[PDB]
Amino acid sequence: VEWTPCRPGGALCGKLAVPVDYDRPDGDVAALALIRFPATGDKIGSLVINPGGPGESGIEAALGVFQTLPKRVHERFDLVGFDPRGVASSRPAIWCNSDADNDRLRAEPQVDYSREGVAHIENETKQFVGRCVDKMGKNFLAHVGTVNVAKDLDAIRAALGDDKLTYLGYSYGTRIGSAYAEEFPQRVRAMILDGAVDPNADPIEAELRQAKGFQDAFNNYAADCAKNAGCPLGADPAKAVEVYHSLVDPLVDPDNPRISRPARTKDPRGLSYSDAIVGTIMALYSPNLWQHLTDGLSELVDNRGDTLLALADMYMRRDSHGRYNNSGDARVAINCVDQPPVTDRDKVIDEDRRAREIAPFMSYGKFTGDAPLGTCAFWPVPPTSQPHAVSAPGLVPTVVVSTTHDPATPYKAGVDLANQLRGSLLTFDGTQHTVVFQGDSCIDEYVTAYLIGGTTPPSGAKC
């Protein structure tokens, strides 16, 4: 890797070629983008991070993380982020939707699960999969999965001059981690997995656990807000879900589920029901955003939706010129190849039945007896991985950080990952998704000690 300064730190940027198909090593090539913040003291090696998603840029993440890196870590490690194959600055980038495509979807309430509804959604999905194949070709799409990102990660380790890998992975990044752990166990110096993905999970049950996670974060946010003056969800947290629906349900035409009646906003779009739900989900990643949710809901009381629109934009990664980054398109393409998709109609219909009961804050009206297949049921390229218990017997002891009320990657998933990995569980008591290098000096203390000294947290370490 020829490094160059970056066109906000001591930052150096560079590229790395990897083969698109590893079985055809001298074929098409991808250029992975890399950023590096050199260590200030005695360098142990590079701390390579990944934010997850998938579709999330590691370069962007390293820039953020840089501001909150502890001084002992920054002394001893190059902070290094990278964009996985097909993501962000890596070429070729995954793209399916135009900016207009994304906008057009987000304007729809996406709430009608009648047969006509389901046919509509499923038709949009086919057109989406078509735009993917059109712009990317089936070969690149076939090899964007974690199984090959794991292999890129070893190339990155090597290219960085490290004998063994020191890795911090958040969320989906914990899948990269455990995958790398299984293929290159003898190359792992240290590894922290914060916000855990259990590769052995049933996809449907995981989804339903994630729905439960967000409904509980909703419960927690609303109980908090109920103690506060002028809570837009009311002073009785047992009624917050209903009150929430009295605020968002009118964004859908009562006699016709397909008609959006958006709340007024300074932006031309206004706020659709779907964007209202998305912005809510976004705010529930972190208590840091609870104030914003409370603002967004107070706005709704006046038929305004500016803050919720801005939250959904944050989630959707839409800048203020209405341009999207490719994280949405990459996320799907990568998710779709990491496991076999659910194609059974009945299971999909049953999940919806169960989801409406587990997470009412998210569901609109009544169970209809029908539900759409996910985008992955229509993928033109087969899964390059498959659910299994992580098995990496000689793996160095790793640290899994799991948060008690994490809506995105629930606590138990952290427990199970640590189990399979035979590593350490460090609990964070909180209602948020991930926590490492995000202000909590206790967590950071354990993580610093593990990174430098190799010292794992004691059994039952809580923080």
Swiss-Prot record:
The molecular function terms in GO held by this entry are: carboxylesterase activity
Q: Which family does it belong to?
A: Belongs to the peptidase S33 family.
| Enzyme Commission number | 3.4.21.-
Q: Any keyword Transmembrane helix?
A: no
Residues forming the catalytic site: S171 (nucleophile), D406, H433 (proton donor)
Q: How does it sit in the membrane?
A: Lipid-anchor
Q: What happens when the gene is disrupted?
A: Disruption of the gene leads to growth defects and attenuates the virulence of Mtb. Disruption of the gene enhances host innate immune responses, compromises the intracellular survival of Mtb in macrophages, and increases its susceptibility to lysozyme. It prolongs survival and reduces lung immunopathology of infected mice. Disruption leads to earlier and significantly higher levels of key pro-inflammatory cytokines and chemokines.
Quaternary assembly: Interacts with GroEL2.
Domain comment from the record reads as follows: The active site region is accessed through a large opening that suggests that the enzyme has endopeptidase activity rather than exopeptidase activity.
Q: Which residues cross the membrane?
A: none
Instruction: List locations, semicolon-separated.
Output: Cell envelope; Cell membrane
Known regulation of its activity is:
Protease activity is inhibited by serine protease inhibitors but not by cysteine protease inhibitors.
Where are the disulfide bridges? C6-C13, C96-C132, C225-C231, C336-C376, C442-C463
Q: What is this protein's name?
A: Serine protease Hip1
- Start and end of every AB hydrolase-1 domain? 45-440
As recorded in Swiss-Prot or TrEMBL, the protein's gene is named hip1
Q: What else is known?
A: Hip1 is an attractive target for developing immunomodulatory therapeutics against Mtb.
- Any one biological process term the GO annotation gives: post-translational protein modification
